[PDB]
Coordinates of C-alpha atoms in Angstrom, one line a residue:
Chain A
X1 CA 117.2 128.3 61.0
X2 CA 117.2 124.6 59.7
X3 CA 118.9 123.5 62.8
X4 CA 116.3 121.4 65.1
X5 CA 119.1 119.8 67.4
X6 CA 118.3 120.2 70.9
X7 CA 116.4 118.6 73.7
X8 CA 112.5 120.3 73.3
X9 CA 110.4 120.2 76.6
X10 CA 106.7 120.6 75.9
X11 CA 105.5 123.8 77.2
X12 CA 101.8 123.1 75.6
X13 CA 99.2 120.8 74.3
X14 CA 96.6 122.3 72.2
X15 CA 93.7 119.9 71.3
X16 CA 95.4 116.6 72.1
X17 CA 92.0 115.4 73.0
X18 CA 90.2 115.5 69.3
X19 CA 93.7 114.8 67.8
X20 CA 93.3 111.5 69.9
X21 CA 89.7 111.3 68.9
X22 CA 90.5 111.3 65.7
X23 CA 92.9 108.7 65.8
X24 CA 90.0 106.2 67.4
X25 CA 92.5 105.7 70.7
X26 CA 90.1 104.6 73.9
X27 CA 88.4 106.9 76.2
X28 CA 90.7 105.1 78.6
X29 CA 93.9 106.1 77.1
X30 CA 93.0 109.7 76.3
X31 CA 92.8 110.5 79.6
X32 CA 95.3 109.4 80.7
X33 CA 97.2 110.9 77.5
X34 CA 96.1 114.2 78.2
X35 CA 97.6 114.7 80.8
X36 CA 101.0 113.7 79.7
X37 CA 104.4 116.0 79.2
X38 CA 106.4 114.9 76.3
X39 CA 110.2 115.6 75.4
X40 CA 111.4 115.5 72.2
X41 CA 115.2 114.8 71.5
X42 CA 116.5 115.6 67.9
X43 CA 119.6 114.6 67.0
X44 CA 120.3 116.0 63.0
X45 CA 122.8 116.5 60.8
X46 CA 122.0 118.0 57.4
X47 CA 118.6 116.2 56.4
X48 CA 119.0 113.5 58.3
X49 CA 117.1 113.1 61.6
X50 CA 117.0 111.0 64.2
X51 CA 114.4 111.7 67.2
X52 CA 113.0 110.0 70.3
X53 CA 109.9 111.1 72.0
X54 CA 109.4 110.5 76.2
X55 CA 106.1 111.3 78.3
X56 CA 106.1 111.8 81.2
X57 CA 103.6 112.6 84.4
X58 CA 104.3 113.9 87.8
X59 CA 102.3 112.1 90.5
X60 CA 101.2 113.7 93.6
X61 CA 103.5 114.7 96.3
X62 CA 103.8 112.5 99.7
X63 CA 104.9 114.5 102.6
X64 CA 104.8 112.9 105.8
X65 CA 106.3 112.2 109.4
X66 CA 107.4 109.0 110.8
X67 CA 104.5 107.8 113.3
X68 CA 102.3 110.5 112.5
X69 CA 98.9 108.9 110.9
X70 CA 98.2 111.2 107.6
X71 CA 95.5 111.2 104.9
X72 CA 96.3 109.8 101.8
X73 CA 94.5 109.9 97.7
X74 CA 96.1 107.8 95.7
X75 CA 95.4 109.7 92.7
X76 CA 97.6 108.0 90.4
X77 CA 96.3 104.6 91.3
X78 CA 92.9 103.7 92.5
X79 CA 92.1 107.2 93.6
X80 CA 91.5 105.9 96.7
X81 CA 91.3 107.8 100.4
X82 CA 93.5 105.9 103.1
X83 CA 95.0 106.8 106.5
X84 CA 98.4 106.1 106.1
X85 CA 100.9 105.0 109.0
X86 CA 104.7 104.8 108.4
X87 CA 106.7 103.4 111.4
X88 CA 110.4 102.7 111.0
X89 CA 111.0 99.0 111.8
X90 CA 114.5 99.0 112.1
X91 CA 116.5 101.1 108.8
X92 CA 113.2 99.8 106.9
X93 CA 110.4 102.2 106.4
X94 CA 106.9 100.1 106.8
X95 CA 103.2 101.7 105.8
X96 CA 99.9 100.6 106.7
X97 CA 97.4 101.9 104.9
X98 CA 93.9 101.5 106.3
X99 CA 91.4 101.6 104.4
X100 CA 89.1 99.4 102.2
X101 CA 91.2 96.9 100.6
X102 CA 92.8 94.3 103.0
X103 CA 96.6 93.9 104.0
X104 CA 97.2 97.1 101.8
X105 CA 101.0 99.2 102.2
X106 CA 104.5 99.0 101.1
X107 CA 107.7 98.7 103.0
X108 CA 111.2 100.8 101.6
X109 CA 114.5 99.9 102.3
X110 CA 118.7 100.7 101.4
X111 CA 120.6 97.9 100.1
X112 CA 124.3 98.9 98.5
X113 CA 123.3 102.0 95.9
X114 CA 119.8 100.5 95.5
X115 CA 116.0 101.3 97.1
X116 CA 113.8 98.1 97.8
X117 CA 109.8 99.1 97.0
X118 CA 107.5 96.1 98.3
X119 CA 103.8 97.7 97.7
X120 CA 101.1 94.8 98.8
X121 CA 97.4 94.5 98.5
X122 CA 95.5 91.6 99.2
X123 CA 97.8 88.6 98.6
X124 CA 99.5 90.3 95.8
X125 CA 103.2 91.8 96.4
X126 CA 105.3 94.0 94.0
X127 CA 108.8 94.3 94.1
X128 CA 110.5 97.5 92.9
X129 CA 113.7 98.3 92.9
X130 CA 115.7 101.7 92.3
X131 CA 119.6 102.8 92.0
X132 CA 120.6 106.1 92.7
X133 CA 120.9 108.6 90.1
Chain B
X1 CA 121.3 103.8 106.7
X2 CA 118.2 105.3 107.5
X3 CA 118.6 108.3 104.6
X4 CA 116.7 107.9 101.9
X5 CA 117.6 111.3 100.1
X6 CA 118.2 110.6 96.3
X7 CA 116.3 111.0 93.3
X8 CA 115.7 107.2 92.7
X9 CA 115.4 105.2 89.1
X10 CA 113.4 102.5 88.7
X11 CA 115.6 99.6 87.5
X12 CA 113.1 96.6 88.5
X13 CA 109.3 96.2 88.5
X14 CA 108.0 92.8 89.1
X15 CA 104.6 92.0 89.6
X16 CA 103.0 95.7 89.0
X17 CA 100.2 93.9 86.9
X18 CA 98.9 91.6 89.7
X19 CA 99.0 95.0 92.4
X20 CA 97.4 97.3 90.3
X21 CA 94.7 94.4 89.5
X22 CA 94.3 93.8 93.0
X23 CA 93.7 97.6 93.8
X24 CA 90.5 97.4 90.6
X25 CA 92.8 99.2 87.8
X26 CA 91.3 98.9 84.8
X27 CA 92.8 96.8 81.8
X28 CA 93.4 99.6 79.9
X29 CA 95.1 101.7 82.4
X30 CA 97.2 98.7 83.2
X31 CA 98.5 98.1 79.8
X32 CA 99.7 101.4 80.0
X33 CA 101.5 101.0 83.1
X34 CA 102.8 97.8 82.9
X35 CA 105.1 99.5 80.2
X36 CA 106.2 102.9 82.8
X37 CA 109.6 103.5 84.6
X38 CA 109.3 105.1 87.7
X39 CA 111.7 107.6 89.3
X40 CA 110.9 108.7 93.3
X41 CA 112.1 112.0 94.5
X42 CA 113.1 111.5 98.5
X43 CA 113.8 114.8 100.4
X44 CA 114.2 113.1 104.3
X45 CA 115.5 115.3 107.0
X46 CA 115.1 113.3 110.2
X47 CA 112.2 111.8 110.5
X48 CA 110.2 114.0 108.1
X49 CA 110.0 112.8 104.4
X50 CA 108.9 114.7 101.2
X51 CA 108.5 112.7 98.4
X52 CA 107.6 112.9 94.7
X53 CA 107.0 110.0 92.1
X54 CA 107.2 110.6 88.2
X55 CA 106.2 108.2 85.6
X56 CA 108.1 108.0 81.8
X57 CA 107.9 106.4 79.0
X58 CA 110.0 105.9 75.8
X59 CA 108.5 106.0 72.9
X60 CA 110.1 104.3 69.5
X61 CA 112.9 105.6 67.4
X62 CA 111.9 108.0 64.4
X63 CA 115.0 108.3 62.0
X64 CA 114.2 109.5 58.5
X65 CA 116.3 111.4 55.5
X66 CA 114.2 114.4 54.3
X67 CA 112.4 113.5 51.1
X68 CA 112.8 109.9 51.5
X69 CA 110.0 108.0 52.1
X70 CA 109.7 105.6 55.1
X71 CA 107.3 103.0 56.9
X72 CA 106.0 104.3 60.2
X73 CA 104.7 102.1 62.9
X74 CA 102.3 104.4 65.5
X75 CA 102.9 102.0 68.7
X76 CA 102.7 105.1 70.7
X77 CA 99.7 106.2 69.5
X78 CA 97.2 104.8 67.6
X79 CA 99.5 101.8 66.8
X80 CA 98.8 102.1 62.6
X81 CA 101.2 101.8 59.5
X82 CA 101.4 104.7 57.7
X83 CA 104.1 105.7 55.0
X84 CA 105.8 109.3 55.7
X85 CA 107.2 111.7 53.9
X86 CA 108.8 114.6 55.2
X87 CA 109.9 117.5 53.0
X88 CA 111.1 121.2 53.1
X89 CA 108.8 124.0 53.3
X90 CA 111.2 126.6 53.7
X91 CA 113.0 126.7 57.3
X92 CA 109.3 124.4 58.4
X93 CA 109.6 120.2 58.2
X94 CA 106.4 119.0 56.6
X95 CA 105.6 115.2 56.7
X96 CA 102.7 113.3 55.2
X97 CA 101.6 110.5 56.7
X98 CA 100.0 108.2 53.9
X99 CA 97.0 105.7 55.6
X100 CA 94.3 105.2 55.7
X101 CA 93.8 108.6 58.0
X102 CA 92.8 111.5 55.9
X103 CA 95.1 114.4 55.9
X104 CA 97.0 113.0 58.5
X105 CA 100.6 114.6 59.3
X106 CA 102.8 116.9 61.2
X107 CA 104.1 121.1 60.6
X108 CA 107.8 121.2 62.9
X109 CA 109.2 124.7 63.1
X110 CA 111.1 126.8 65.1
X111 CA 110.9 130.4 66.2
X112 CA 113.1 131.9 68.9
X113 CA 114.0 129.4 71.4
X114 CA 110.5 127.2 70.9
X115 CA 109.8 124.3 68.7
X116 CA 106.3 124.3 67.3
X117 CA 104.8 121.4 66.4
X118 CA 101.3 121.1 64.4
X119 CA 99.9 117.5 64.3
X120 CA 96.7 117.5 61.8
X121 CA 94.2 114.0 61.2
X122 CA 91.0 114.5 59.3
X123 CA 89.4 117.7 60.9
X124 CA 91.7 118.4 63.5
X125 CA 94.4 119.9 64.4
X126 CA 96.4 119.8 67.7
X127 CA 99.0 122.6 68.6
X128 CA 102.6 121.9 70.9
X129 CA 105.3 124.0 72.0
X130 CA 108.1 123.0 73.5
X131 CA 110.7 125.0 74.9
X132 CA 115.0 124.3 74.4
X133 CA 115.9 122.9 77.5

């Protein structure tokens, strides 16, 4: 077949490491790169193509009970180990996470269709915010 | 409410840049995040929680005609301009990507209900499948 249309989830990655290598991108990027899903979307029509590449990358799962102190790694961040503490404080979900860094955790809420992420270390705050899908 | 269940999409992100610096990210890692969308998993039943976080990214657009050249921009990748060609070996799409890389291209080709995918620069050669979703 000369038919390509579809949505194509990668299965494998052969050698994306000396591919990259070859390409001169940064240690920094390849490893991060390597460990990357892509999904190609091909839209055709005779010999003409049009396609759009994603990545993506699953983080770690975080299981845990309200109140109940729990070890965490935060392996897609800072790789990190803290002892996290969620407590409700009304409908809003608040974490402490003790550790090193000072002041660190996040707080989640419901607003409407939309989840409120406020992640804090230090003196810095980000603000995330989600609609259901 | 206090039910969190959803599978969540990042619509807003403010701020990610000064977190991840407070938490010692590197530069490189946070250029590459800066530019993610997030989407949280929530299972909740009570007051237990199981949650999972993936990280995507888009990259460009790739239209082409086969057997008309066109400019290629690698912002993705190794962020070069090459000029591609992609031809017709048979039922297999063969581009050229003319740059300064040597032999640098891509083999597409599909057998059964997987897209194969062969991406060559200078001495090597990296191998993806990718199965029809």
């Amino acid at each position: 077949t000369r038919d390509f249309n579809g949505t194509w989830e990668m299965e494998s990655n052969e050698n994306f490491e000396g591919y990259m290598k070859a390409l001169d991108i940064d240690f920094a990027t390849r490893k991060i790169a390597v460990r990357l899903t892509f999904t190609d979307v091909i839209d055709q029509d005779g010999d003409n193509f049009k396609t759009k590449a994603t990545s993506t990358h699953l983080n770690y799962d975080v299981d845990f009970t309200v109140g109940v102190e729990f070890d965490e790694y935060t392996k897609s961040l800072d790789n990190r180990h803290v002892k996290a503490l969620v407590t409700w404080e009304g409908d809003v979900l608040v974490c402490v996470q003790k550790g090193e860094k000072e002041n660190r955790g996040w707080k989640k809420w419901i607003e409407g269709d939309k989840l409120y992420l406020e992640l804090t270390c230090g003196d810095q705050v980000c603000r995330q915010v989600f609609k259901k899908k």
